Amino acid sequence: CDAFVGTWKLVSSENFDDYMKEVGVGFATRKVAGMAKPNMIISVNGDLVTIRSESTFKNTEISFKLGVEFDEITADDRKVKSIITLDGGALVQVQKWDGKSTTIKRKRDGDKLVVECVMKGVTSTRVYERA
Amino acid sequence: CDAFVGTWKLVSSENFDDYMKEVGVGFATRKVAGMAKPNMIISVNGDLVTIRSESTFKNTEISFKLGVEFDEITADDRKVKSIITLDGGALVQVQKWDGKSTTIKRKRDGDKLVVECVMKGVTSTRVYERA
Numbered sequence: 001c002d003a004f005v006g007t008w009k010l011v012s013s014e015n016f017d018d019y020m021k022e023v024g025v026g027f028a029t030r031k032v033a034g035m036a037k038p039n040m041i042i043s044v045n046g047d048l049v050t051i052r053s054e055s056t057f058k059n060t061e062i063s064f065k066l067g068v069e070f071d072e073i074t075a076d077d078r079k080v081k082s083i084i085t086l087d088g089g090a091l092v093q094v095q096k097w098d099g100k101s102t103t104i105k106r107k108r109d110g111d112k113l114v115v116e117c118v119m120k121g122v123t124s125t126r127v128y129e130r131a
Numbered sequence: 132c133d134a135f136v137g138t139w140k141l142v143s144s145e146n147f148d149d150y151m152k153e154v155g156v157g158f159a160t161r162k163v164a165g166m167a168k169p170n171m172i173i174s175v176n177g178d179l180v181t182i183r184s185e186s187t188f189k190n191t192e193i194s195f196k197l198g199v200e201f202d203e204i205t206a207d208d209r210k211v212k213s214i215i216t217l218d219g220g221a222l223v224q225v226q227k228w229d230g231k232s233t234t235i236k237r238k239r240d241g242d243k244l245v246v247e248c249v250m251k252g253v254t255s256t257r258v259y260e261r262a
């Protein structure tokens with residue numbers, strides 16, 4: 001996933017509070033999240049890919065092998081099972097917990113990285129540019 | 132309530148989508164409501180006060196006597212019991228339905244009319260100026 005490696009900074013967000021509401025994130029955490037302008041750092045070492053998100057409030061980091069299910073504790077503190085595959089040049093992540101699931105797709109668009117988050121028909125789009 | 136009579140147009144809104152989420156309004160109706168810039172028309176005839184809200188999408192109208200509980204069907208189609216009193220120069224409305232309640236306060240602030248909506252600790256503020 002060489003096209004993804006680097007440090008990226010958030011440029012725009014669309015419908016992310018609606019997505020967080022659908023996931024069940026509480027009011028105060030949604031308000032902190034809408035104030036954060038995270039940096040995303042992606043790196044690869046052998047067959048482990050790492051995605052780190054850094055903000056004043058909370059940093060998250062996951063390291064995984066593409067295709068192997070793993071445990072992840074999300075920024076809003078859900079304990080989920082995640083699997084990320086490389087499909088059509090995009091990193092496609094599915095998180096499952098309590099009989100629910102959500103899909104987070106990270107893809108390149110021009111010189112940007114676009115994150116699309118989908119939960120039961122609500123879709124949010126976040127655009128990042130290279131820092 | 133002479134200080135309220137007139138036609139008013141929305142100038143700003145703060146946290147109204149969060150208030151609607153707390154009330155239980157669905158995604159599409161919340162999206163229509165956030166696109167509307169309603170006009171509010173208040174008039175008095177004898178002891179009946181009328182508050183009408185007009186938008187491209189939906190008009191609502193309630194007529195009431197201050198202090199007498201009445202039936203109201205809200206813009207998002209809840210059937211509620213409402214009572215509005217005049218307290219401290221503000222119109223204070225309480226709506227009750229299914230064991231829940233929310234308070235909508237309409238007050239003058241300078242040359243503006245301010246609507247404050249409260250549902251379980253989430254507060255939204257909408258400011259109107261004379262049309």
Ligand SMILES: CCCCCCCC/C=C\CCCCCCCC(=O)O
Pocket residue numbers: 020025029032033036040053057058074075076104115117126
């Ligand atoms: C005090 C907590 C501060 C941080 C709160 C962040 C809350 C985020 C909420 C839900 C996580 C959803 C999963 C991440 C989606 C991708 C976001 C992105 O990379 O832009």
Ligand SMILES: CCCCCCCC/C=C\CCCCCCCC(=O)O
Pocket residue numbers: 151156160163164167171184188189205206207235246248257
């Ligand atoms: C197709 C429907 C179009 C209109 C949708 C409007 C939805 C409003 C949602 C909930 C009603 C809450 C009660 C009104 C609060 C006061 C609003 C105001 O006067 O500014």
